[PDB]
Amino acid sequence: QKYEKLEKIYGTVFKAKNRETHEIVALKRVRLDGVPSSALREICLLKELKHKNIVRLHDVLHSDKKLTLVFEFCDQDLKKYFDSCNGDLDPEIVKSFLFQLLKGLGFCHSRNVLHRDLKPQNLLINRNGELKLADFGLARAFGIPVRCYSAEVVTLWYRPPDVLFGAKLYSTSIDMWSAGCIFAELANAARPLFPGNDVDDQLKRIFRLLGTPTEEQWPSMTKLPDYKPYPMYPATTSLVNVVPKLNATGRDLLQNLLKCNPVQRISAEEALQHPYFS
């Protein structure tokens, strides 16, 4: 109640002033009548993920049979940012954004958390130029030898091929692929790099550009629940075609992030220690 709702941006999001301390936050408000369990997980994880590049969770209120997560406030999501400016970002912004994402993401992995929902809309950006990871609704902790997780993670266009192939078990490499996609988006007209209409289509666009995986490069792929032998499309690996506002060094990183075989994906640490960053 110590809040003042304003323009209205799980449940619905609101901007607000603490009214008492005058600070502006963002309220989520979750209806308590699976959504709740997802919300309680986000809260649990966030409480243990404090980093300038990870959205902060100030409080959590239980009122009127609703849970209101009092979050810090960010000017806009990266998706809207892409609309703010248009078709282009100074190659320097591209670097900054990837850096902070890679840093905020590298942190989650170190604290044993998979975000599993990395897409432009879940990346917050302040006018001050800083970027923060948000919406951990799909996140989860990992460490305990689990039989498997779930394959219903990550929006279609950022879903890595292994998961598309029905893989139920995955590692931190899963957020790395999404990161690569976001990078591609970052360094171009800001349009998604692989916008399929369904799983089958998603796979095609990916292999059509990266080249279809061969059992040699990705041995365990055929053993996946929903694996399908797609035509061996050439490897248009001359990514330059698909990402011009990016040097040759940068393209090298984008290539290590977009490896179809999960195991071949660079980690956040490595990514950050990559030449592209100086």
Partner: protein, 147 residues
């Protein structure tokens, strides 16, 4: 194996709620077995949740949550189910679960209250037992010797 750790859980739950010398380690287990059973109202979960690791994760919450002065099993089953609910939420293989089989309490307002109380007191341990194998072993061990 599941079962075995379960009895230990029950065992423990009786040594904790001493105020109810009418309780058997089998009841608490029957309660845990029930929801995880009906939850198989498919489309909810293709695989059973209760596993060694998960029972342990669960014993972890109960450990620091179940008051020793619990008055009436109904109160136990409620808090125990709140714990179970969180375990599902946090360790669940699905990206989510229903609240039907967990809310046995009347005052819905209180169920969600515990959910917040527990989350605020156990959030760190919930993540640690996952990120710190040695910590997993200590809880696993403690649980094993609660028999």
């Amino acid at each position: 194996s599941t079962s075995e750790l379960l009895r230990c859980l029950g065992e423990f739950l009786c040594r904790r709620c001493y105020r109810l010398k009418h309780l058997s380690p089998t009841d608490p287990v029957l309660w845990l077995r029930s929801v995880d059973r009906s939850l198989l109202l498919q489309g909810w979960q293709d695989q059973g949740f209760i596993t060694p690791a998960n029972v342990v994760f669960l014993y972890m919450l109960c450990r620091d949550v179940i008051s020793s002065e619990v008055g009436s099993d109904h109160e136990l089953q409620a808090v125990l189910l709140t714990c179970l609910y969180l375990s599902y939420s946090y360790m669940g293989n699905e990206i989510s679960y229903p609240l039907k089989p967990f809310l046995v309490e009347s005052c819905k307002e209180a169920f969600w209250d515990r959910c917040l109380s527990v989350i605020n007191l156990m959030s760190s341990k919930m993540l640690q037992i996952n990120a710190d194998p040695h910590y997993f072993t200590q809880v696993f061990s403690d649980l094993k010797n609660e028999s």
